[PDB]
Design a protein around this ligand. Structure first.
Ligand SMILES: NC[C@H]1O[C@H](O[C@H]2[C@H](O)[C@@H](O[C@H]3O[C@H](CO)[C@@H](O)[C@H](N)[C@H]3O)[C@H](N)C[C@@H]2N)[C@H](N)C[C@@H]1O
Ligand SMILES: Nc1ncnc2c1ncn2[C@@H]1O[C@H](COP(=O)(O)CP(=O)(O)OP(=O)(O)O)[C@@H](O)[C@H]1O
Ligand SMILES: [Mn+2]
Ligand SMILES: [Mn+2]
Length: 176
């Protein structure tokens, strides 16, 4: 909705002012890379420089929100009725990287668009990688249609063959 889109704009405007890079992830990242809103989104997934967490928290608080909960992978924040699902990325040689994700997870270039404005967003590979973790908890056939359709859309955008090679790499990484 306009509330989320406006909120995304406000968060990134504030981050830009501090030269704080933030990467849109998850469902909004798919829509950003496509340059098209495809459905309603339940939250906003964000990736932030882990060593600058305080700056993202300060922006959340500046916008009238609060940190709500710590997660195994990051933290949960709330601005009004909108949920922000935040994960750190850590400096790895010459770029920020999400822990355990494929290299290039956090490109410096803005490769997506939301409401006409370029935005940084996680790579297709990083977006798809998180579905592999999900598949390991819940069989894909048992996913809500939301997740099935989002997955298939991301898959088609990147290329099915690239996805199946990536999935083989995931299986190899976590094989036991
Ligand atoms: N990078 C390593 C991590 O990757 C994945 O986490 C991913 C989480 O599963 C993602 O969170 C998802 O799962 C959580 C519940 O775990 C939901 O609350 C949330 N809305 C949903 O988006 C979150 N938004 C991104 C994160 N990369 C793995 N599930 C855990 C792993 O430690
Ligand atoms: N219980 C769970 N365990 C692990 N990964 C999960 C998960 N639930 C969701 N995920 C993964 O997290 C990513 C997206 O998470 P969610 O934010 O909950 C939905 P989404 O694709 O962002 O749509 P949305 O825009 O409506 O939020 C996908 O990779 C999905 O597979
Ligand atoms: Mn989401
Ligand atoms: Mn989420």
């Amino acid at each position: 909705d306009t509330t989320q889109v406006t909120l995304i704009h406000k968060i990134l405007a504030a981050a830009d002012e501090r030269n704080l890079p933030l990467w849109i992830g998850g469902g909004w990242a798919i829509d950003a890379r496509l340059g098209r809103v495809t459905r309603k989104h339940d939250d906003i997934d964000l990736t932030f420089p882990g060593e600058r967490r305080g700056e993202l928290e300060a922006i959340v608080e500046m916008l009238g929100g609060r940190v709500m909960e710590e997660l195994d992978y990051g933290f949960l924040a709330e601005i009004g009725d909108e949920l922000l699902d935040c994960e750190p990325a850590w400096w790895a040689d010459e770029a920020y990287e999400i822990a355990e994700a494929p290299q290039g997870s956090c490109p410096e270039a803005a490769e997506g668009v939301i409401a006409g404005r370029p935005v940084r967003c996680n790579s297709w590979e990083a977006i798809i990688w998180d579905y592999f973790y999900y598949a390991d908890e819940v069989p894909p056939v048992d996913w809500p249609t939301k997740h099935i359709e989002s997955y298939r859309l991301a898959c088609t955008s990147l290329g099915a063959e690239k996805v199946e090679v990536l999935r083989a790499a995931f299986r190899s990484r976590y094989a036991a």
